[PDB]
């Protein structure tokens, strides 16, 4: 409803920064609502969910299982690791490691995870090959939160990234049961409180990721609905903000407030 494209307008003279919307239709896919649909945007840790999605797609060919234990090392350790951090020593299976990235943004457990599936140039060449022809990762954690102006790398657009997202959740992409173990590790995201979760009505469904990276950089990915059930698709990023984390929240979560309210 435009009504929202109001709060995104208020969200981008508040925040001195660009920000890109979108309202998808899960069911058809039609983009409800947009602003900046077709600008390029940084990913951030919203490419977690891509990531996973490439792996899971490789455990439904037969290429990898969930339950592989792999092994790292000090060297691998990057900044913010909570999970990955605590089984240096036994090491996590792939199934752990998509839990983590997902559910805690554990960027060690990100770039593991790439390693298995080729790096950000097999995620790229996955993510075309099931028709998403813009997003694109070139590096890895933590260089990929950079956004520095005008760099196309680890970018997104807002309709590229909602249309990307509705093929892995419900799409024939993946078989029904990896499409489900996607939606459950979105499901349980323990670090997206203050964006759209702070604004969902009880007894709504939301399965989300959010990122945050340098140079005011945020955004959020869900799929969300009533009832208990997802019927929509929301993108929201935005780059080049001074303002403080807890302003950007605030932003992001008055337009997630708006879309529910004009549901």
Same mark, same amino acid.
């Given at each position: &409803?435009?009504?929202?494209? /109001?709060?995104?307008?208020?969200?981008?003279?508040?925040?001195?920064?660009?920000?890109?919307?979108?309202?998808?239709?899960? !069911?058809?896919?039609?983009?409800?609502?947009? =602003?900046?649909?077709?600008?390029?945007?940084?990913?951030?840790?919203?490419?977690?969910?891509?990531?996973?999605?490439?792996?899971?797609?490789?455990?439904?060919?037969?290429?990898?299982?969930?339950?592989?234990?792999?092994?790292?090392?000090?060297?691998?350790?990057?900044?913010?690791?909570? /999970?990955?951090?605590? &089984?240096?020593?036994?090491?996590?299976?792939?199934?752990?490691?998509?839990?983590?990235?997902?559910?805690?943004?554990? !960027?060690?457990?990100?770039?593991?995870?790439?390693?298995?599936?080729?790096?950000?140039?097999?995620?790229?060449? =996955?993510? &075309?090959?099931?028709?998403? &022809?813009?997003?694109?990762?070139?590096?890895?954690?933590?260089?990929?939160?950079?956004?520095?102006?005008?760099?196309?790398?680890?970018?997104?657009?807002?309709?590229?990234?909602?249309?990307?997202?509705?093929?892995?959740?419900?799409?024939?992409?993946?078989? *029904?049961?990896?499409?489900?173990?996607?939606?459950?590790?979105?499901?349980?995201?323990?670090?997206?409180? *203050?964006?759209?979760?702070?604004?969902? *009505?009880?007894?709504?469904?939301?399965?989300?990721?959010?990122?945050?990276?340098?140079?005011?950089?945020?955004?959020?990915?869900?799929?969300?609905?009533?009832?208990?059930?997802?019927?929509?698709?929301?993108?929201?990023?935005?780059?080049?903000?001074?303002?403080?984390?807890?302003?950007?929240?605030?932003?992001?979560?008055?337009?997630?407030?708006?879309?529910?309210?004009?549901?």
């Amino acid at each position: &409803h435009p009504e929202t494209l /109001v709060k995104v307008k208020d969200a981008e003279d508040q925040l001195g920064a660009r920000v890109g919307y979108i309202e998808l239709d899960l !069911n058809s896919g039609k983009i409800l609502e947009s =602003f900046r649909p077709e600008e390029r945007f940084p990913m951030m840790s919203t490419f977690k969910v891509l990531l996973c999605g490439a792996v899971l797609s490789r455990v439904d060919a037969g290429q990898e299982q969930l339950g592989r234990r792999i092994h790292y090392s000090q060297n691998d350790l990057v900044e913010y690791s909570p /999970v990955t951090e605590k &089984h240096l020593t036994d090491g996590m299976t792939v199934r752990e490691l998509c839990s983590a990235a997902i559910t805690m943004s554990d !960027n060690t457990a990100a770039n593991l995870l790439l390693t298995t599936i080729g790096g950000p140039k097999e995620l790229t060449a =996955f993510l &075309h090959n099931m028709g998403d &022809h813009v997003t694109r990762l070139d590096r890895w954690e933590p260089e990929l939160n950079e956004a520095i102006p005008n760099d196309e790398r680890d970018t997104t657009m807002p309709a590229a990234m909602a249309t990307t997202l509705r093929k892995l959740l419900t799409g024939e992409l993946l078989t *029904p049961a990896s499409r489900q173990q996607l939606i459950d590790w979105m499901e349980a995201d323990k670090v997206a409180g *203050p964006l759209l979760r702070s604004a969902l *009505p009880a007894g709504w469904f939301i399965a989300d990721k959010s990122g945050a990276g340098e140079r005011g950089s945020r955004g959020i990915i869900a799929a969300l609905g009533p009832d208990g059930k997802p019927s929509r698709i929301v993108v929201i990023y935005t780059t080049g903000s001074q303002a403080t984390m807890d302003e950007r929240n605030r932003q992001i979560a008055e337009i997630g407030a708006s879309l529910i309210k004009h549901w």
